[PDB]
PDB file of C-alpha atoms and ligand atoms in Angstrom:
ATOM      1  CA  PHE N  23      57.177 106.482 100.889  1.00  0.00           C
ATOM      2  CA  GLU N  24      56.724 102.704 100.768  1.00  0.00           C
ATOM      3  CA  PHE N  25      59.756 100.434 101.169  1.00  0.00           C
ATOM      4  CA  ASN N  26      59.667  96.637 101.079  1.00  0.00           C
ATOM      5  CA  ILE N  27      62.408  94.186 102.059  1.00  0.00           C
ATOM      6  CA  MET N  28      62.601  90.430 102.514  1.00  0.00           C
ATOM      7  CA  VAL N  29      64.896  88.302 104.684  1.00  0.00           C
ATOM      8  CA  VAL N  30      66.073  85.097 103.011  1.00  0.00           C
ATOM      9  CA  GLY N  31      68.163  82.209 104.208  1.00  0.00           C
ATOM     10  CA  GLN N  32      68.383  78.942 106.067  1.00  0.00           C
ATOM     11  CA  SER N  33      66.451  78.537 109.302  1.00  0.00           C
ATOM     12  CA  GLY N  34      68.200  79.230 112.586  1.00  0.00           C
ATOM     13  CA  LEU N  35      70.169  82.237 111.326  1.00  0.00           C
ATOM     14  CA  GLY N  36      68.400  85.024 113.243  1.00  0.00           C
ATOM     15  CA  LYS N  37      66.233  86.171 110.321  1.00  0.00           C
ATOM     16  CA  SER N  38      63.074  86.623 112.389  1.00  0.00           C
ATOM     17  CA  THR N  39      65.163  88.235 115.118  1.00  0.00           C
ATOM     18  CA  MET N  40      66.631  90.640 112.547  1.00  0.00           C
ATOM     19  CA  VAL N  41      63.152  91.651 111.313  1.00  0.00           C
ATOM     20  CA  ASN N  42      62.273  92.747 114.843  1.00  0.00           C
ATOM     21  CA  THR N  43      65.665  94.457 115.229  1.00  0.00           C
ATOM     22  CA  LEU N  44      64.897  96.583 112.156  1.00  0.00           C
ATOM     23  CA  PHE N  45      61.526  97.780 113.466  1.00  0.00           C
ATOM     24  CA  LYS N  46      62.851  98.170 117.029  1.00  0.00           C
ATOM     25  CA  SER N  47      65.920 100.238 116.095  1.00  0.00           C
ATOM     26  CA  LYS N  48      66.607 103.180 118.425  1.00  0.00           C
ATOM     27  CA  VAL N  49      67.222 105.363 115.354  1.00  0.00           C
ATOM     28  CA  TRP N  50      63.464 105.797 114.886  1.00  0.00           C
ATOM     29  CA  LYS N  51      61.570 108.191 117.152  1.00  0.00           C
ATOM     30  CA  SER N  52      58.224 106.365 116.823  1.00  0.00           C
ATOM     31  CA  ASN N  53      56.284 103.484 118.378  1.00  0.00           C
ATOM     32  CA  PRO N  54      56.415  99.685 118.040  1.00  0.00           C
ATOM     33  CA  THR N  61      59.550  84.168 117.473  1.00  0.00           C
ATOM     34  CA  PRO N  62      59.151  80.440 116.756  1.00  0.00           C
ATOM     35  CA  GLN N  63      60.511  78.692 113.686  1.00  0.00           C
ATOM     36  CA  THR N  64      58.660  80.581 110.959  1.00  0.00           C
ATOM     37  CA  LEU N  65      56.709  78.113 108.828  1.00  0.00           C
ATOM     38  CA  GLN N  66      55.283  80.218 105.978  1.00  0.00           C
ATOM     39  CA  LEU N  67      55.775  83.562 104.281  1.00  0.00           C
ATOM     40  CA  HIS N  68      54.240  86.440 106.203  1.00  0.00           C
ATOM     41  CA  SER N  69      54.783  90.190 106.153  1.00  0.00           C
ATOM     42  CA  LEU N  70      54.945  92.811 108.909  1.00  0.00           C
ATOM     43  CA  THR N  71      54.176  96.444 108.083  1.00  0.00           C
ATOM     44  CA  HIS N  72      54.889  99.376 110.401  1.00  0.00           C
ATOM     45  CA  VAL N  73      55.123 103.104 109.693  1.00  0.00           C
ATOM     46  CA  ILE N  74      58.356 104.490 111.182  1.00  0.00           C
ATOM     47  CA  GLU N  75      59.512 108.111 111.385  1.00  0.00           C
ATOM     48  CA  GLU N  76      63.226 108.864 111.064  1.00  0.00           C
ATOM     49  CA  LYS N  77      63.610 112.642 111.465  1.00  0.00           C
ATOM     50  CA  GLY N  78      60.051 113.755 110.806  1.00  0.00           C
ATOM     51  CA  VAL N  79      59.887 111.801 107.530  1.00  0.00           C
ATOM     52  CA  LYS N  80      57.146 109.189 107.144  1.00  0.00           C
ATOM     53  CA  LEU N  81      57.978 105.722 105.834  1.00  0.00           C
ATOM     54  CA  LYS N  82      55.795 102.619 105.456  1.00  0.00           C
ATOM     55  CA  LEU N  83      58.323  99.800 105.907  1.00  0.00           C
ATOM     56  CA  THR N  84      57.299  96.212 105.164  1.00  0.00           C
ATOM     57  CA  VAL N  85      59.599  93.289 106.005  1.00  0.00           C
ATOM     58  CA  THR N  86      58.642  89.870 104.640  1.00  0.00           C
ATOM     59  CA  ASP N  87      59.924  86.955 106.738  1.00  0.00           C
ATOM     60  CA  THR N  88      60.424  83.597 105.066  1.00  0.00           C
ATOM     61  CA  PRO N  89      60.646  79.882 105.848  1.00  0.00           C
ATOM     62  CA  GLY N  90      64.015  78.203 105.730  1.00  0.00           C
ATOM     63  CA  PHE N  91      65.478  75.715 103.303  1.00  0.00           C
ATOM     64  CA  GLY N  92      68.250  73.165 103.326  1.00  0.00           C
ATOM     65  CA  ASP N  93      66.779  71.220 106.268  1.00  0.00           C
ATOM     66  CA  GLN N  94      65.623  68.352 104.022  1.00  0.00           C
ATOM     67  CA  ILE N  95      67.546  65.570 102.346  1.00  0.00           C
ATOM     68  CA  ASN N  96      66.427  66.830  98.917  1.00  0.00           C
ATOM     69  CA  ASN N  97      66.286  70.648  98.710  1.00  0.00           C
ATOM     70  CA  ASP N  98      65.712  70.966  94.965  1.00  0.00           C
ATOM     71  CA  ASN N  99      63.352  73.811  94.023  1.00  0.00           C
ATOM     72  CA  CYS N 100      63.317  75.082  97.623  1.00  0.00           C
ATOM     73  CA  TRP N 101      63.584  78.602  96.122  1.00  0.00           C
ATOM     74  CA  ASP N 102      60.187  78.380  94.405  1.00  0.00           C
ATOM     75  CA  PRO N 103      58.008  79.877  97.198  1.00  0.00           C
ATOM     76  CA  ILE N 104      60.335  82.886  97.543  1.00  0.00           C
ATOM     77  CA  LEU N 105      60.694  83.458  93.796  1.00  0.00           C
ATOM     78  CA  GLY N 106      56.945  83.010  93.419  1.00  0.00           C
ATOM     79  CA  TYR N 107      56.370  85.802  95.920  1.00  0.00           C
ATOM     80  CA  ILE N 108      58.760  88.194  94.145  1.00  0.00           C
ATOM     81  CA  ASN N 109      57.111  87.544  90.770  1.00  0.00           C
ATOM     82  CA  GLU N 110      53.563  87.865  92.120  1.00  0.00           C
ATOM     83  CA  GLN N 111      54.443  91.375  93.325  1.00  0.00           C
ATOM     84  CA  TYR N 112      55.766  92.272  89.872  1.00  0.00           C
ATOM     85  CA  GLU N 113      52.575  90.814  88.394  1.00  0.00           C
ATOM     86  CA  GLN N 114      50.265  92.753  90.724  1.00  0.00           C
ATOM     87  CA  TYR N 115      52.162  95.982  90.039  1.00  0.00           C
ATOM     88  CA  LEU N 116      51.878  95.621  86.255  1.00  0.00           C
ATOM     89  CA  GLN N 117      48.091  95.246  86.460  1.00  0.00           C
ATOM     90  CA  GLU N 118      47.862  98.316  88.719  1.00  0.00           C
ATOM     91  CA  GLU N 119      50.039 100.495  86.465  1.00  0.00           C
ATOM     92  CA  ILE N 120      47.809  99.564  83.510  1.00  0.00           C
ATOM     93  CA  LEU N 121      44.533 100.456  85.236  1.00  0.00           C
ATOM     94  CA  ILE N 122      45.235 103.347  87.634  1.00  0.00           C
ATOM     95  CA  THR N 123      47.832 105.333  85.744  1.00  0.00           C
ATOM     96  CA  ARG N 124      49.299 107.615  88.412  1.00  0.00           C
ATOM     97  CA  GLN N 125      52.139 106.646  90.745  1.00  0.00           C
ATOM     98  CA  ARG N 126      50.448 108.306  93.727  1.00  0.00           C
ATOM     99  CA  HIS N 127      47.657 105.688  93.667  1.00  0.00           C
ATOM    100  CA  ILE N 128      49.529 102.441  92.897  1.00  0.00           C
ATOM    101  CA  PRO N 129      50.408 100.370  96.001  1.00  0.00           C
ATOM    102  CA  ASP N 130      53.964  99.087  95.660  1.00  0.00           C
ATOM    103  CA  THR N 131      54.386  95.594  97.119  1.00  0.00           C
ATOM    104  CA  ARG N 132      57.507  94.853  95.056  1.00  0.00           C
ATOM    105  CA  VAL N 133      60.518  93.545  96.986  1.00  0.00           C
ATOM    106  CA  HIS N 134      63.074  96.363  96.846  1.00  0.00           C
ATOM    107  CA  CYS N 135      65.884  94.408  98.526  1.00  0.00           C
ATOM    108  CA  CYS N 136      66.555  90.861  99.695  1.00  0.00           C
ATOM    109  CA  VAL N 137      68.769  90.390 102.747  1.00  0.00           C
ATOM    110  CA  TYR N 138      70.392  86.968 102.295  1.00  0.00           C
ATOM    111  CA  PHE N 139      71.700  85.369 105.490  1.00  0.00           C
ATOM    112  CA  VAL N 140      74.940  83.380 105.095  1.00  0.00           C
ATOM    113  CA  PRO N 141      75.755  80.849 107.873  1.00  0.00           C
ATOM    114  CA  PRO N 142      78.903  81.921 109.937  1.00  0.00           C
ATOM    115  CA  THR N 143      80.773  78.722 109.091  1.00  0.00           C
ATOM    116  CA  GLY N 144      84.137  80.427 108.595  1.00  0.00           C
ATOM    117  CA  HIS N 145      84.677  78.407 105.414  1.00  0.00           C
ATOM    118  CA  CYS N 146      83.181  79.453 102.065  1.00  0.00           C
ATOM    119  CA  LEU N 147      79.852  79.701 100.264  1.00  0.00           C
ATOM    120  CA  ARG N 148      77.941  76.432 100.149  1.00  0.00           C
ATOM    121  CA  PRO N 149      76.648  75.079  96.816  1.00  0.00           C
ATOM    122  CA  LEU N 150      73.065  75.502  98.061  1.00  0.00           C
ATOM    123  CA  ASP N 151      73.598  79.188  98.870  1.00  0.00           C
ATOM    124  CA  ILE N 152      75.319  79.816  95.518  1.00  0.00           C
ATOM    125  CA  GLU N 153      72.381  78.332  93.612  1.00  0.00           C
ATOM    126  CA  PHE N 154      69.920  80.409  95.611  1.00  0.00           C
ATOM    127  CA  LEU N 155      71.935  83.635  95.288  1.00  0.00           C
ATOM    128  CA  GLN N 156      72.375  83.249  91.525  1.00  0.00           C
ATOM    129  CA  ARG N 157      68.600  83.055  91.065  1.00  0.00           C
ATOM    130  CA  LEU N 158      67.638  85.876  93.430  1.00  0.00           C
ATOM    131  CA  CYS N 159      70.043  88.354  91.837  1.00  0.00           C
ATOM    132  CA  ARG N 160      68.438  87.574  88.472  1.00  0.00           C
ATOM    133  CA  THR N 161      65.231  89.357  89.554  1.00  0.00           C
ATOM    134  CA  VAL N 162      65.799  91.389  92.765  1.00  0.00           C
ATOM    135  CA  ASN N 163      68.385  93.387  94.703  1.00  0.00           C
ATOM    136  CA  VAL N 164      70.363  91.165  97.081  1.00  0.00           C
ATOM    137  CA  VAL N 165      72.448  92.255 100.063  1.00  0.00           C
ATOM    138  CA  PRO N 166      74.171  89.285 101.742  1.00  0.00           C
ATOM    139  CA  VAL N 167      75.072  89.276 105.424  1.00  0.00           C
ATOM    140  CA  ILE N 168      77.105  87.020 107.676  1.00  0.00           C
ATOM    141  CA  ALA N 169      74.375  85.845 110.075  1.00  0.00           C
ATOM    142  CA  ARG N 170      74.833  85.627 113.861  1.00  0.00           C
ATOM    143  CA  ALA N 171      78.313  86.988 113.361  1.00  0.00           C
ATOM    144  CA  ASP N 172      79.063  87.106 117.102  1.00  0.00           C
ATOM    145  CA  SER N 173      79.755  83.368 116.770  1.00  0.00           C
ATOM    146  CA  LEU N 174      82.998  84.410 114.988  1.00  0.00           C
ATOM    147  CA  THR N 175      85.819  86.585 116.297  1.00  0.00           C
ATOM    148  CA  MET N 176      86.602  89.959 114.740  1.00  0.00           C
ATOM    149  CA  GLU N 177      89.529  88.405 112.853  1.00  0.00           C
ATOM    150  CA  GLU N 178      87.346  85.504 111.690  1.00  0.00           C
ATOM    151  CA  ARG N 179      84.587  87.790 110.380  1.00  0.00           C
ATOM    152  CA  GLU N 180      87.095  89.718 108.265  1.00  0.00           C
ATOM    153  CA  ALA N 181      88.741  86.604 106.809  1.00  0.00           C
ATOM    154  CA  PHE N 182      85.314  85.057 106.130  1.00  0.00           C
ATOM    155  CA  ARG N 183      84.054  88.264 104.476  1.00  0.00           C
ATOM    156  CA  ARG N 184      86.987  88.178 102.023  1.00  0.00           C
ATOM    157  CA  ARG N 185      86.443  84.499 101.155  1.00  0.00           C
ATOM    158  CA  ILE N 186      82.745  85.097 100.429  1.00  0.00           C
ATOM    159  CA  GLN N 187      83.614  88.160  98.339  1.00  0.00           C
ATOM    160  CA  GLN N 188      85.925  85.891  96.353  1.00  0.00           C
ATOM    161  CA  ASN N 189      83.266  83.193  96.034  1.00  0.00           C
ATOM    162  CA  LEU N 190      80.755  85.756  94.743  1.00  0.00           C
ATOM    163  CA  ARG N 191      83.237  86.830  92.060  1.00  0.00           C
ATOM    164  CA  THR N 192      84.048  83.259  91.023  1.00  0.00           C
ATOM    165  CA  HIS N 193      80.352  82.461  90.582  1.00  0.00           C
ATOM    166  CA  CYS N 194      79.526  85.844  88.979  1.00  0.00           C
ATOM    167  CA  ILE N 195      76.942  86.683  91.660  1.00  0.00           C
ATOM    168  CA  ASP N 196      76.538  90.417  91.090  1.00  0.00           C
ATOM    169  CA  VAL N 197      75.382  91.710  94.459  1.00  0.00           C
ATOM    170  CA  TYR N 198      74.106  95.135  95.491  1.00  0.00           C
ATOM    171  CA  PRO N 199      75.502  97.698  94.947  1.00  0.00           C
ATOM    172  CA  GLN N 200      76.103  96.183  91.508  1.00  0.00           C
ATOM    173  CA  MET N 201      79.296  97.544  89.979  1.00  0.00           C
ATOM    174  CA  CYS N 202      77.727  98.030  86.531  1.00  0.00           C
ATOM    175  CA  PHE N 203      75.141 100.499  87.887  1.00  0.00           C
ATOM    176  CA  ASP N 204      77.800 102.799  89.392  1.00  0.00           C
ATOM    177  CA  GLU N 205      76.907 106.071  87.691  1.00  0.00           C
ATOM    178  CA  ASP N 206      78.410 109.425  88.750  1.00  0.00           C
ATOM    179  CA  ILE N 207      82.039 110.270  89.500  1.00  0.00           C
ATOM    180  CA  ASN N 208      81.808 109.612  93.244  1.00  0.00           C
ATOM    181  CA  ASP N 209      79.173 106.879  93.287  1.00  0.00           C
ATOM    182  CA  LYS N 210      82.032 104.375  93.171  1.00  0.00           C
ATOM    183  CA  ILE N 211      84.019 106.190  95.872  1.00  0.00           C
ATOM    184  CA  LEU N 212      81.104 105.560  98.250  1.00  0.00           C
ATOM    185  CA  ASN N 213      79.921 102.250  96.761  1.00  0.00           C
ATOM    186  CA  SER N 214      83.380 100.633  96.832  1.00  0.00           C
ATOM    187  CA  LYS N 215      83.489 101.415 100.556  1.00  0.00           C
ATOM    188  CA  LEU N 216      80.214  99.491 100.811  1.00  0.00           C
ATOM    189  CA  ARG N 217      81.239  96.641  98.498  1.00  0.00           C
ATOM    190  CA  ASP N 218      84.365  96.193 100.625  1.00  0.00           C
ATOM    191  CA  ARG N 219      82.113  95.690 103.662  1.00  0.00           C
ATOM    192  CA  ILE N 220      79.492  93.469 102.007  1.00  0.00           C
ATOM    193  CA  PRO N 221      78.635  90.937 103.281  1.00  0.00           C
ATOM    194  CA  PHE N 222      77.961  92.754 106.566  1.00  0.00           C
ATOM    195  CA  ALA N 223      78.736  90.851 109.785  1.00  0.00           C
ATOM    196  CA  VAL N 224      75.462  91.444 111.606  1.00  0.00           C
ATOM    197  CA  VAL N 225      74.017  90.607 115.020  1.00  0.00           C
ATOM    198  CA  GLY N 226      70.315  90.749 115.860  1.00  0.00           C
ATOM    199  CA  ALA N 227      68.512  91.540 119.100  1.00  0.00           C
ATOM    200  CA  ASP N 228      64.910  92.158 120.111  1.00  0.00           C
ATOM    201  CA  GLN N 229      65.719  92.845 123.792  1.00  0.00           C
ATOM    202  CA  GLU N 230      66.568  96.173 125.431  1.00  0.00           C
ATOM    203  CA  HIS N 231      69.197  96.380 128.160  1.00  0.00           C
ATOM    204  CA  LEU N 232      70.545  99.130 130.412  1.00  0.00           C
ATOM    205  CA  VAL N 233      74.285  99.513 129.758  1.00  0.00           C
ATOM    206  CA  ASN N 234      76.116 102.377 131.483  1.00  0.00           C
ATOM    207  CA  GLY N 235      72.932 104.404 131.824  1.00  0.00           C
ATOM    208  CA  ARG N 236      72.010 103.760 128.175  1.00  0.00           C
ATOM    209  CA  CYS N 237      68.970 101.918 126.821  1.00  0.00           C
ATOM    210  CA  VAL N 238      70.285  99.814 123.927  1.00  0.00           C
ATOM    211  CA  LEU N 239      69.276  96.798 121.856  1.00  0.00           C
ATOM    212  CA  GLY N 240      71.526  93.868 122.639  1.00  0.00           C
ATOM    213  CA  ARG N 241      72.197  90.211 123.278  1.00  0.00           C
ATOM    214  CA  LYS N 242      72.789  89.547 126.988  1.00  0.00           C
ATOM    215  CA  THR N 243      75.359  86.765 127.410  1.00  0.00           C
ATOM    216  CA  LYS N 244      77.179  85.530 130.506  1.00  0.00           C
ATOM    217  CA  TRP N 245      80.225  87.612 129.502  1.00  0.00           C
ATOM    218  CA  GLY N 246      78.491  90.853 128.518  1.00  0.00           C
ATOM    219  CA  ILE N 247      75.896  92.526 126.336  1.00  0.00           C
ATOM    220  CA  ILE N 248      76.508  92.625 122.585  1.00  0.00           C
ATOM    221  CA  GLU N 249      75.147  95.990 121.408  1.00  0.00           C
ATOM    222  CA  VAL N 250      73.745  95.475 117.916  1.00  0.00           C
ATOM    223  CA  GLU N 251      73.554  99.206 117.114  1.00  0.00           C
ATOM    224  CA  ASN N 252      77.132  99.740 118.299  1.00  0.00           C
ATOM    225  CA  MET N 253      79.501  99.851 115.332  1.00  0.00           C
ATOM    226  CA  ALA N 254      82.328  98.481 117.506  1.00  0.00           C
ATOM    227  CA  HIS N 255      80.274  95.360 118.286  1.00  0.00           C
ATOM    228  CA  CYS N 256      78.831  94.420 114.886  1.00  0.00           C
ATOM    229  CA  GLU N 257      77.940  95.820 111.464  1.00  0.00           C
ATOM    230  CA  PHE N 258      74.142  95.925 111.774  1.00  0.00           C
ATOM    231  CA  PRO N 259      74.186  99.762 111.626  1.00  0.00           C
ATOM    232  CA  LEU N 260      75.702  99.513 108.155  1.00  0.00           C
ATOM    233  CA  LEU N 261      72.853  97.274 106.996  1.00  0.00           C
ATOM    234  CA  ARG N 262      70.216  99.386 108.742  1.00  0.00           C
ATOM    235  CA  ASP N 263      71.565 102.597 107.222  1.00  0.00           C
ATOM    236  CA  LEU N 264      72.062 101.152 103.724  1.00  0.00           C
ATOM    237  CA  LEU N 265      68.448  99.951 103.509  1.00  0.00           C
ATOM    238  CA  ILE N 266      66.574 102.808 105.211  1.00  0.00           C
ATOM    239  CA  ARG N 267      68.802 105.912 105.207  1.00  0.00           C
ATOM    240  CA  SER N 268      71.377 106.086 102.422  1.00  0.00           C
ATOM    241  CA  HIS N 269      70.322 103.760  99.561  1.00  0.00           C
ATOM    242  CA  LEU N 270      66.551 103.365  99.971  1.00  0.00           C
ATOM    243  CA  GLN N 271      65.858 105.440  96.866  1.00  0.00           C
ATOM    244  CA  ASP N 272      68.657 103.797  94.862  1.00  0.00           C
ATOM    245  CA  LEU N 273      67.225 100.352  95.650  1.00  0.00           C
ATOM    246  CA  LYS N 274      63.724 101.437  94.618  1.00  0.00           C
ATOM    247  CA  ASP N 275      65.073 102.988  91.401  1.00  0.00           C
ATOM    248  CA  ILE N 276      66.825  99.740  90.409  1.00  0.00           C
ATOM    249  CA  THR N 277      63.780  97.605  91.277  1.00  0.00           C
ATOM    250  CA  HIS N 278      61.440  99.737  89.159  1.00  0.00           C
ATOM    251  CA  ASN N 279      63.751 100.572  86.250  1.00  0.00           C
ATOM    252  CA  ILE N 280      65.746  97.333  85.844  1.00  0.00           C
ATOM    253  CA  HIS N 281      64.200  94.372  87.654  1.00  0.00           C
ATOM    254  CA  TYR N 282      60.549  95.277  87.077  1.00  0.00           C
ATOM    255  CA  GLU N 283      61.216  96.233  83.451  1.00  0.00           C
ATOM    256  CA  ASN N 284      63.058  92.940  82.929  1.00  0.00           C
ATOM    257  CA  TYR N 285      60.010  91.125  84.315  1.00  0.00           C
ATOM    258  CA  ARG N 286      57.539  92.577  81.802  1.00  0.00           C
ATOM    259  CA  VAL N 287      59.784  91.314  78.965  1.00  0.00           C
ATOM    260  CA  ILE N 288      57.933  88.023  79.509  1.00  0.00           C
ATOM    261  CA  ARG N 289      54.543  89.786  79.683  1.00  0.00           C
TER     262      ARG N 289
HETATM  263  N1  LIG S 301      74.403  84.313 118.706  1.00  0.00           N
HETATM  264  C1  LIG S 301      73.349  84.869 118.072  1.00  0.00           C
HETATM  265  N2  LIG S 301      72.145  84.257 118.190  1.00  0.00           N
HETATM  266  C2  LIG S 301      71.069  84.800 117.573  1.00  0.00           C
HETATM  267  C3  LIG S 301      71.213  86.038 116.788  1.00  0.00           C
HETATM  268  N3  LIG S 301      69.993  86.335 116.289  1.00  0.00           N
HETATM  269  C4  LIG S 301      69.137  85.364 116.713  1.00  0.00           C
HETATM  270  N4  LIG S 301      69.786  84.468 117.492  1.00  0.00           N
HETATM  271  C5  LIG S 301      69.225  83.266 118.116  1.00  0.00           C
HETATM  272  O1  LIG S 301      69.102  82.288 117.091  1.00  0.00           O
HETATM  273  C6  LIG S 301      67.951  81.481 117.330  1.00  0.00           C
HETATM  274  C7  LIG S 301      67.082  81.494 116.078  1.00  0.00           C
HETATM  275  O2  LIG S 301      66.839  82.853 115.695  1.00  0.00           O
HETATM  276  P1  LIG S 301      65.643  83.201 114.673  1.00  0.00           P
HETATM  277  O3  LIG S 301      65.400  84.686 114.678  1.00  0.00           O
HETATM  278  O4  LIG S 301      64.424  82.351 114.935  1.00  0.00           O
HETATM  279  O5  LIG S 301      66.297  82.825 113.259  1.00  0.00           O
HETATM  280  P2  LIG S 301      65.449  82.198 112.059  1.00  0.00           P
HETATM  281  O6  LIG S 301      65.240  80.720 112.241  1.00  0.00           O
HETATM  282  O7  LIG S 301      66.254  82.451 110.813  1.00  0.00           O
HETATM  283  O8  LIG S 301      64.076  82.827 111.948  1.00  0.00           O
HETATM  284  C8  LIG S 301      67.257  82.094 118.535  1.00  0.00           C
HETATM  285  O9  LIG S 301      67.682  81.388 119.706  1.00  0.00           O
HETATM  286  C9  LIG S 301      67.814  83.489 118.619  1.00  0.00           C
HETATM  287  O10 LIG S 301      67.791  83.983 119.963  1.00  0.00           O
HETATM  288  C10 LIG S 301      72.559  86.637 116.717  1.00  0.00           C
HETATM  289  O11 LIG S 301      72.755  87.695 116.075  1.00  0.00           O
HETATM  290  N5  LIG S 301      73.549  86.006 117.367  1.00  0.00           N
HETATM  291 MG1  LIG S 302      62.079  82.785 111.499  1.00  0.00          MG
END
């Protein structure tokens, strides 16, 4: 009943806004932003439909702002490995699952800038290293800066770039198991990367209290599937694939880590 995710990407892409959007989603029936400068984690226990879930989201500093960005992935990778390390020591000492705190990163949400072009070399290098040790779901950040047509065309280009550079992204096609896993996973692969919009403000729209971005032309409703694809990301992580992500972390990624220990 513990689920951990991490937001990764260049600064100025709405990452910290998206962390708040996740905890503030109207889907939960429970209770409860400068340029982030170091890694810090926020933990809140949310209740979906009577089910209890301790959700931790780790927010990260950006990269790519400097002239030389070499090794800018080291803090993030260091965090992911230190959670694998801590878990191995705990499994050795206290043997039972019920008593081991799981701080392992079960999914990384990687924020791609909405350039409309294609994946930058910097993002390719970062993605190729993250997928080597963690689940990665990429998203088109701040996607309201593109039109509907432009999001779709940009999604396809990125999907092509991922294939060219062999970046196997979640849901990885090799781990498709049962007959109809693919029938539901291909529908998700076709949508990934999700074109997401983040909001930490509530607005009253036609008698409805919704999360949204208030602009001069209207309110962009981030939980409205006609406005953006945030509900797909929110449901993939928390509702439909939470267990599948945790299974892959523990059985593949974590087991691959102890091959060096
Ligand atoms: N247009 C648009 N702006 C956003 C979105 N999410 C956040 N912002 C704005 O982007 C700026 C930086 O957002 P922030 O959450 O700090 O991103 P971070 O630097 O990655 O942590 C702020 O002015 C936000 O209000 C979005 O989905 N669309
Ligand atoms: Mg931030």
